[PDB]
Amino acid sequence: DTSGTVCLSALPPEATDTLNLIASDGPFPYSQDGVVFQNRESVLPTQSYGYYHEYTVITPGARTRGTRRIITGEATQEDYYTGDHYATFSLIDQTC
């Protein structure tokens, strides 16, 4: 299940950067950016393979991809933010 919705302005600035790169279809900083997100644990609504894709939300100072990500859903304006390494997700509202 999702943990509600959150305004883009309420997320780390890096989340805005990630969405801008998604809008231009990259290029992305990490090789894992753009790969299919399987939603293996069924936290997000059930959809067929390929409906979801994942992108890194850079954590300042991190040597690794960290724990922040944006999962895109194929529907219009459907994007999910997780700041706890896929444990919980919140729908991102780019209008606020």
UniProtKB/Swiss-Prot annotation:
UniProt lineage: Bacteria, Bacillati, Actinomycetota, Actinomycetes, Kitasatosporales
SUPFAM superfamilies reported for this sequence: Microbial ribonucleases
Recorded catalytic activity of this chain's protein: [RNA] containing guanosine + H2O = an [RNA fragment]-3'-guanosine-3'-phosphate + a 5'-hydroxy-ribonucleotide-3'-[RNA fragment]
Keywords for this protein: Disulfide bond, Endonuclease, Hydrolase, Lyase, Nuclease, Secreted
Keyword presence, Ribonucleoprotein: no
EC numbers for this chain: 4.6.1.24
Organism: Kitasatospora aureofaciens
Cystine connections: 7-96
UniProt KW Ribosomal protein keyword: no
Active site annotation, chain numbering: 54, 85
Assigned GO CC terms: extracellular region
Protein name (database record): Guanyl-specific ribonuclease Sa
Protein family according to the UniProt entry: Belongs to the ribonuclease N1/T1 family.
InterPro entries: N1-like, Ribonuclease/ribotoxin
Compartments where found: Secreted
The organism's place on the tree of life at top rank: Bacteria
Gene: rnaSA
Molecular function in Gene Ontology: lyase activity; ribonuclease T1 activity; RNA binding; RNA endonuclease activity
